[PDB]
Every structure is written in structure tokens, then in C-alpha cells.
Amino acid sequence: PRGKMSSYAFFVQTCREEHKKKHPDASVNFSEFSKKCSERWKKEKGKFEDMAKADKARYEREKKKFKDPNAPKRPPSAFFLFCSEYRPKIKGEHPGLSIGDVAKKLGEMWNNTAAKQPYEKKAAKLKEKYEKD
Amino acid sequence: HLLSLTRRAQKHRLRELKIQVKEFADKEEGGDVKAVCLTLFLLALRARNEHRQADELEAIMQGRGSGLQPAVCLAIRVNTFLSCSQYHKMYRTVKAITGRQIFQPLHALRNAEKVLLPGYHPFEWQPPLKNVSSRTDVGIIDGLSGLASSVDEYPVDTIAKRFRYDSALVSALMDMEEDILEGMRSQDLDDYLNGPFTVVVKESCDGMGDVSEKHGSGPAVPEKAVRFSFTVMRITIEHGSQNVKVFEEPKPNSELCCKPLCLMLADESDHETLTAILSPLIAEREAMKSSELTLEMGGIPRTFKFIFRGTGYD
Amino acid sequence: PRQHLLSLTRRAQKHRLRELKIQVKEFADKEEGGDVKAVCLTLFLLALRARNEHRQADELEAIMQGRGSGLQPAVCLAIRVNTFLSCSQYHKMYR
Amino acid sequence: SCDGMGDVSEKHGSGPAVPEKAVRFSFTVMRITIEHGSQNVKVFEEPKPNSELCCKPLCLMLADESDHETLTAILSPLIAEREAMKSSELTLEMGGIPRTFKFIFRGTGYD
DNA sequence: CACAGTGATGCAAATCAAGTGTGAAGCCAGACAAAAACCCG
DNA sequence: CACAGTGATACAGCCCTTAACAAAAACCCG
Ligand SMILES: [Ca+2]
Ligand SMILES: [Ca+2]
């Protein structure tokens, strides 16, 4: 789902192929090419306008939220501390684990370890400081 | 007509002016195009006397949270005579149209109400109240006070609701913390003082009439209604050998300072039910008329003594 | 000594940008009809989208079109009527 | 529709002696119908016919519902207008296009 | 088959985080078309 | 000297414009 070219476009494309084949290592500047087609369009266009138009019928066949308030928001949870403390472990042990699969792994790890005090009591103290501040 | 087309064309139209503004910004501020354009548009709005839109723009350039805390929403909902249904209607309308929450939902207000209502602040009487529980979390105690409603017992045909007298006094005193603090600060008194404050309260009781009875199931209640309220009048402190009037109600006859205490549905001339309902209140009153209250507001435990007066009786 | 543009007051900023003001107004009422505010917010939206801040541009379009963070008088009138508000109570609420 | 309202207290101050009653008068649209092709079809019918949100008030006065003289003296202009409008057509602009209207009056909200 | 509310009480649905690295829709240098609505021809 | 409302009207108050002057708060240099 995107756009298409035109008659004028599929001769600039041939010029693009030309100046990309004359030196396929310096396709960095556009100003030179901007002053290149000025002479190429000042003959040898019908055979290209044909393939340009050939894409005419072809191409025709294809929330408001908050705005940075103050930040007494969402104190971290026990599972959040577990993640923040054990994701880099598996990351350095296995870098290929995107946090979708890595988070599934960390979760099934948390879903096997029995419940506590370093997580839940700390989260409760954080929530207590949260309600006050 | 400009300001109505799409892009890549209005640019092509204003390209000259845009490059001129760019040159001017490079010459003046080196390329601070955003700030200079913002200032130019603000002054352009101010020229046509459109202060509202300009203020909204300069406020949103910060991008800030213009949300009301639930206390303000509760104050608006109470002091403007709004039912919960109409408030919810207004709430959903504003949220759906403005795409944000200027107001708070109902549950937030409900949760905030539990602070102003009695039975939320701790307190204790240094002389224990005779025949009065020391628990300090009771809310709306039933008015019948556990009256026997059996078929053999004297019949009961009235309903009533009310608070605990001492809890009501504690809540009323905690409601006027800022006023007492400002009175002490204005009368050349240190705020951390905890002298034996003296409080005078005016009581009142009247019997209403023509209150329509409702349908449904329950006891056959009469139509005459009776209420009973009080009002904190004046407070003094014993500083040295004087009595400084730290606070006095400026409108002692306004409905905005007559706090309720008890409601019932009975005749005023019905001497049996009237006494059967008002006995616990008089009991608590006579009990606390020989004690002193202490509580900590502003981080300092204070001392209170009550001198009641009953005058609002026809 | 120069400090910063927005650090000045309103009159001082006007004194400092009077030249650009005259230039923009004349080059806008020569050919673009004469609606100064139109060209102003158009150029501002363009310079803001140069920093691809779609959010800020959308918020400004909502403000200048009346559809967010501010009610048109008909909507608040409907709120004041259909909720049985009085004229003094709505005033207190609006005050 | 029309009805008399009792128990409407009188205020102090200046003015004529106002009786302690009240009489209202209102109307309500029911169904709009266009003649398309060879038959008729409705366009907008009232979903809630007895709702208060569609009872448009027209006339208001403080008089007895049995004071026949005053009642007729107040309601005769409205009846004259109704009789004059029962044989006319209205031209009205809706969305920038003139429209044609003709009415059929029916009074049923009378006890 | 009057009806627009009255409250609390309860349950169901959105969210929301804090972690995280990749993917994606504008924006730019000119600039000759690609139509397209005007003049009247 | 009950007292909080209650909707419309008038007027003060507080923003806006142009136009040259005129005073106020600072840094190079002597
Ligand atoms: Ca009475
Ligand atoms: Ca009647």
C-alpha cells in the first residue's frame, strides 16, 4: 500500500540508474542530480513513458491522553523490581532474547519461584511514600 | 482560500515569506524560528483582542496537567446543589467532548468524603467517658439505640439516624483547623501553644411538619419530622490571666454553620418516642460535660473544654 | 545587554519585533488577502512540523478550531440548562 | 395540551391582585411526512411522545381555569392564529435550501 | 404500556506500568510534470 | 438587626492600538 510513478517519473528513474551506475559509490548529493535532469528534459521518452503509464491501472488495484503532568505516578511493583533486577542477567547471558520472549521467560521464572520481603515490603514502603508525596 | 488547503501548496505560496522569516531569525537569534514565530503569533492574537486563545496557547506550550483534585470536585458538587446523576452527566459530557478529565469520577469523590465525615480521626478523653465507648471509628449509629421492637414490647413506628456526639465534635473541630491556626497567628500567639482551649456550642431542636410519607415496605411512620443540630460559636484560650477570643462565627444565624447531629420521624408532642430517642444524646452530653478532650492537629496535641448552651428551642 | 527573546515583556517584545511585524503584515495583505492571523498560525504550524511535533500541531489545531481544552458557548449552555444549574450557581462554579 | 394548576402562591409587592392558580398551554410535534413518488413516508416521529423533553411551552398566565371570560380573552388570539394557519403554507430555509411546510392540528391533551 | 432520575453496591473492562531494542511515518534539498479551474477561442 | 439567592442592566476596570519622547538598569573603556 503505497504510491506510484508517472510519465515524468520513469525517465528520472532511468537517469537515476544512469548516475548510480556511472559511480555506485557516491550517491550522497542530490543538488548535482537536481541540476542533471534540467538538461535531460530540455526524444527517447516514449519507450519509457510506456512503462511509466503501464503502472496506471496496476497501482489502481492496490488518541488523547495526559500531557506530561507532575510525576507522583505509578510506584513500582514487586514484579517490576524482579524484572529490573533480573532482565539484564538473561540479556547478558542471551542477547538474542527480545523482551517479548525474554519477558515471557522472566515471567515463567517468577511463576515458579515461591513467594517476598525485599519485594513486597519495599513496594509497600514506596506506596506509603507515594500517598504522602 | 488559504488556511484551508492541504500542505505542499500553502508552503509553495508562502515560501518567500518563510525564507524571509528564516533570514530574519538567522540575523537576530541565529535561527530560533520556533520562539520568534510563537511570539509573533501571540502578539497577533493579542492585537485582535483574543486573550483567551493566546492564554490557552501559552499554557499548552508548557503542556501541563490542568486536572482538579477530588477535593475541589467535591466542593463544587456539594456547594452548588448538584445531584450525583447530574454531576455524572456533566462529567461524561466534558470528558467526551474535551477529550480529557478536567473533573474527577464519582468514586474519587466518594473516597475523599470519608475524610470529612466523622469516625476518621483518632482522639481520646483523658477522663474516660462514663457509659460511652472509647472506640473511635463509629459512623452513623442507628437512632433507635437498640430499642426493643418485639410484638410484646411497646410498639415502634419511627426511624432515626445520628452520629456519636463526641465524634461529631471531634470532626467539627478538625474541620476548623485552619481558622483556629489563623486566629492564633493573628492575635500575636505562637501556633505551637497547646493551652486548654474552651469551646461553646449552641444546640437547637425543632419539629417540622407536612412531610409526606412514602410507599413501600416498613413501619408505618408518621408525617411529623424532628431534627437536632448544634453549632460551634466561640473559642478562647487562657493566656496569662486573660481569655483571648481566637475565633468567633461571623454569621451565627447562617445555615452554612449549622451542622446536623440527628434526624427522626416523630411528633414533637409525642413525649415517649422523643425521650426514647434523645436519651443517649443527653447522656453523652452530661457525661462529657465533666471531662476534657485532647487531639493532635498541626502536629501538636491540644486540650479542649466544652461549655454547652441550649437556646435554639421555641 | 541581550539576554533572550521570551525573557522580555510584551511591550519590549513588540518594540523588538515591530519590523518583522510590519514586513509580515504588508507581505501578507499585498497578495494573500490580508488575514494576518491566518498566515501567522500557518507559518507557525509549518515551523513546528519542521520539528515533526505532530502532537503540538494537532493541539494547536484543536485550540484554534474549538474542539478541546475549552468549550464553545453552546455546549456549556447545554450543560448549564440540562443540569438545572442556576445563573448564580453556575457563576460560582465558573468563578 | 392545556391544564389548570392549583396551589400557586402569590408574592408580595406591587401589581394587580393575582389569583392563586395557574394555567399553561403547550404543543408537541408528532410526525413529519413527505409525499414522495405516489405515496407518503415518515421522516421524523417522536420516540418518546409523553416525555417532558419535547413539551414546548407556548402560553403562560395566572388565572382560574373556570374564569371563562379571562380564559377566552387570553386564548382568543392563539385560536385566531391557529385558524389562520390552518389554511396556509410556510417557506423555510433548511441547510440553505427553501422548504415547504403544511400543518395538521390536533388537540388531544385536554382532560 | 409515564419517565428521568436517587443512592449505593457490585462486577467487568481498560490501563499501566518499567523494563527494550528495532520499525515506521513525516521532513529536506529542486523541479519538471499531472491535473485542474480560470481567461475567453 | 437572618440570610442566601436571582436574573437582567449599567458602569468601572482592565486588556488592546499609534506616537514619538523620556527615564531606568546594566557593560566597555577611561
Ligand atoms: Ca417547627
Ligand atoms: Ca390540573
Side-chain angles (χ1 to χ4, degrees), chain A residues 1 3 6-9 11-12 14-15 19 22-31 33-34 36-39 41 46 48 50-55 57 61-63 65-66 68-72 75-89 92 94-100 103 106-116 118-120 123-124 126 130, chain B residues 2 4-129 131-295 297-314, chain C residues 1-10 12-95, chain D:
Chain A
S6 66
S7 158
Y8 179 78
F11 184 76
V12 177
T14 62
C15 294
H19 82 276
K22 69 183 288 184
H23 188 273
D25 193 75
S27 178
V28 296
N29 191 0
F30 182 76
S31 178
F33 179 74
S34 178
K36 180 67 174 66
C37 292
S38 179
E39 293 83 4
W41 291 96
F48 293 162
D50 192 0
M51 68 181 180
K53 259 64 127 288
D55 198 2
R61 332 284 316 237
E62 60 88 20
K63 186 183 287 185
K65 295 183 289 294
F66 61 91
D68 194 345
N70 209 168
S77 178
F79 182 75
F80 291 164
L81 295 175
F82 183 74
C83 293
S84 66
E85 292 179 353
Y86 291 95
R87 290 183 186 271
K89 299 291 180 68
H94 297 285
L97 293 175
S98 66
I99 65 167
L106 241 192
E108 67 183 1
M109 186 66 203
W110 181 256
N111 290 318
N112 290 318
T113 61
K116 184 183 286 185
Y119 294 100
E120 292 179 353
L126 291 173
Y130 180 79
Chain B
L2 75 162
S4 66
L5 280 70
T6 189
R7 312 141 221 256
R8 297 295 91 193
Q10 63 183 357
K11 184 178 184 293
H12 186 273
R13 293 179 67 188
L14 295 174
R15 183 177 182 270
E16 297 125 90
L17 185 61
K18 182 67 181 294
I19 195 66
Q20 183 178 2
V21 173
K22 180 68 173 66
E23 292 178 353
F24 182 76
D26 291 330
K27 182 174 71 68
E28 294 293 328
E29 294 294 328
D32 192 359
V33 177
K34 183 263 290 180
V36 65
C37 292
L38 182 62
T39 301
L40 183 62
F41 181 70
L42 290 174
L43 274 71
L45 293 175
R46 299 292 177 91
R48 293 181 181 178
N49 191 0
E50 292 180 353
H51 296 284
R52 184 180 67 189
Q53 294 180 357
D55 290 331
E56 294 293 328
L57 184 63
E58 68 183 1
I60 197 66
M61 289 297 104
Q62 298 194 349
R64 61 95 175 268
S66 66
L68 292 173
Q69 64 183 357
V72 175
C73 294
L74 181 62
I76 294 170
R77 207 216 107 230
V78 173
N79 205 165
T80 60
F81 291 160
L82 288 174
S83 66
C84 294
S85 179
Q86 299 296 322
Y87 181 77
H88 181 74
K89 289 179 61 200
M90 180 176 69
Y91 164 81
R92 60 91 58 80
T93 300
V94 174
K95 184 177 179 180
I97 293 171
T98 61
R100 62 180 293 165
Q101 293 180 357
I102 296 92
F103 279 135
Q104 296 296 321
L106 294 174
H107 63 87
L109 277 71
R110 228 203 286 316
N111 203 165
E113 288 178 353
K114 292 182 181 180
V115 176
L116 294 174
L117 294 175
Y120 183 73
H121 290 169
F123 64 93
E124 62 89 19
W125 294 89
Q126 183 62 255
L129 293 175
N131 297 115
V132 175
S133 178
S134 66
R135 221 142 72 74
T136 61
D137 62 357
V138 296
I140 299 169
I141 302 299
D142 185 75
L144 280 74
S145 296
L147 184 62
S149 66
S150 66
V151 65
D152 291 331
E153 185 65 27
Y154 183 78
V156 176
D157 59 356
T158 62
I159 61 170
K161 298 293 183 182
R162 63 125 182 148
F163 294 101
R164 254 266 287 316
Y165 210 117
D166 62 356
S167 178
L169 292 174
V170 172
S171 179
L173 292 175
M174 292 298 291
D175 185 74
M176 293 182 287
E177 182 179 1
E178 293 84 3
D179 290 331
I180 298 169
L181 292 174
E182 192 275 331
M184 292 184 287
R185 292 178 293 173
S186 66
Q187 295 294 321
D188 192 0
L189 293 175
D190 54 354
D191 59 356
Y192 64 90
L193 183 62
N194 58 4
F197 293 99
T198 300
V199 176
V200 177
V201 177
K202 180 176 72 68
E203 293 179 353
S204 296
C205 182
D206 186 74
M208 295 177 71
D210 291 331
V211 176
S212 296
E213 185 179 1
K214 292 182 175 67
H215 295 283
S217 66
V221 297
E223 293 179 353
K224 292 181 181 179
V226 175
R227 63 181 293 166
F228 183 76
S229 296
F230 64 92
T231 297
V232 176
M233 294 300 293
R234 117 168 40 112
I235 299 170
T236 57
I237 189 167
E238 184 178 1
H239 186 273
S241 296
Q242 293 82 17
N243 291 318
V244 176
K245 188 182 291 293
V246 298
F247 181 75
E248 184 179 2
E249 181 66 27
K251 293 186 286 184
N253 289 318
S254 179
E255 69 273 16
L256 294 175
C257 65
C258 183
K259 296 177 73 68
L261 182 65
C262 181
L263 297 174
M264 68 185 75
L265 295 175
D267 188 359
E268 184 179 1
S269 296
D270 192 0
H271 184 76
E272 291 83 3
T273 301
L274 185 64
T275 59
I277 300 299
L278 293 175
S279 296
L281 281 74
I282 302 299
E284 293 178 353
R285 183 177 181 270
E286 182 65 27
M288 66 182 72
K289 196 133 79 169
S290 295
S291 177
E292 63 185 342
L293 182 63
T294 184
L295 58 87
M297 64 185 32
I300 300 298
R302 301 292 179 89
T303 299
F304 293 99
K305 292 181 181 180
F306 293 99
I307 298 170
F308 299 101
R309 291 182 184 271
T311 61
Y313 294 164
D314 58 355
Chain C
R2 296 181 186 270
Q3 295 178 356
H4 192 272
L5 183 62
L6 61 88
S7 66
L8 277 67
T9 189
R10 296 175 184 174
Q13 290 178 356
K14 185 177 180 180
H15 179 74
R16 301 267 310 261
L17 294 175
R18 65 186 185 273
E19 183 178 1
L20 183 63
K21 183 177 179 180
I22 296 169
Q23 292 179 356
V24 173
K25 288 184 178 181
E26 65 183 1
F27 291 162
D29 66 359
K30 285 180 182 180
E31 192 273 331
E32 294 293 328
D35 193 0
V36 177
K37 186 273 297 298
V39 177
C40 290
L41 89 159
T42 300
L43 293 175
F44 183 76
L45 290 174
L46 292 175
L48 189 148
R49 294 289 296 272
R51 240 54 161 315
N52 66 13
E53 293 178 353
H54 300 285
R55 183 240 260 230
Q56 296 299 109
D58 291 331
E59 290 177 352
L60 189 148
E61 182 66 27
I63 297 298
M64 294 299 291
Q65 188 88 263
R67 341 202 278 77
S69 179
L71 283 73
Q72 65 182 357
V75 174
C76 63
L77 183 62
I79 296 169
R80 166 222 175 269
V81 174
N82 202 164
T83 61
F84 294 100
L85 291 173
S86 179
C87 183
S88 296
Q89 297 295 322
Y90 181 77
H91 181 73
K92 291 173 70 175
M93 185 185 80
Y94 153 99
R95 200 184 45 197
Chain D
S1 296
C2 181
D3 190 359
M5 293 177 70
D7 291 331
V8 176
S9 66
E10 184 178 1
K11 295 180 177 67
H12 295 285
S14 66
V18 175
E20 188 178 1
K21 293 182 183 293
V23 176
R24 294 180 65 251
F25 184 76
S26 296
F27 64 92
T28 299
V29 298
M30 294 299 291
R31 99 192 18 132
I32 297 169
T33 300
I34 189 168
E35 183 178 1
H36 187 273
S38 179
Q39 65 182 357
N40 290 318
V41 64
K42 64 179 73 175
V43 176
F44 146 54
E45 65 182 1
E46 182 66 26
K48 298 293 183 182
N50 290 318
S51 178
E52 65 184 1
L53 295 175
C54 64
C55 182
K56 293 183 183 293
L58 183 64
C59 182
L60 295 175
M61 79 205 135
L62 295 174
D64 189 359
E65 65 182 1
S66 296
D67 190 359
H68 183 74
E69 293 83 4
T70 300
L71 184 63
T72 60
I74 299 299
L75 293 175
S76 65
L78 294 174
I79 301 300
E81 293 179 353
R82 182 176 181 268
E83 293 293 328
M85 292 175 70
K86 239 181 275 209
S87 66
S88 179
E89 293 180 353
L90 183 62
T91 300
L92 191 282
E93 81 187 283
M94 293 178 71
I97 297 91
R99 300 292 179 90
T100 300
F101 292 98
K102 65 179 73 175
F103 293 99
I104 296 170
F105 286 94
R106 293 178 64 87
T108 61
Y110 292 164
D111 60 357

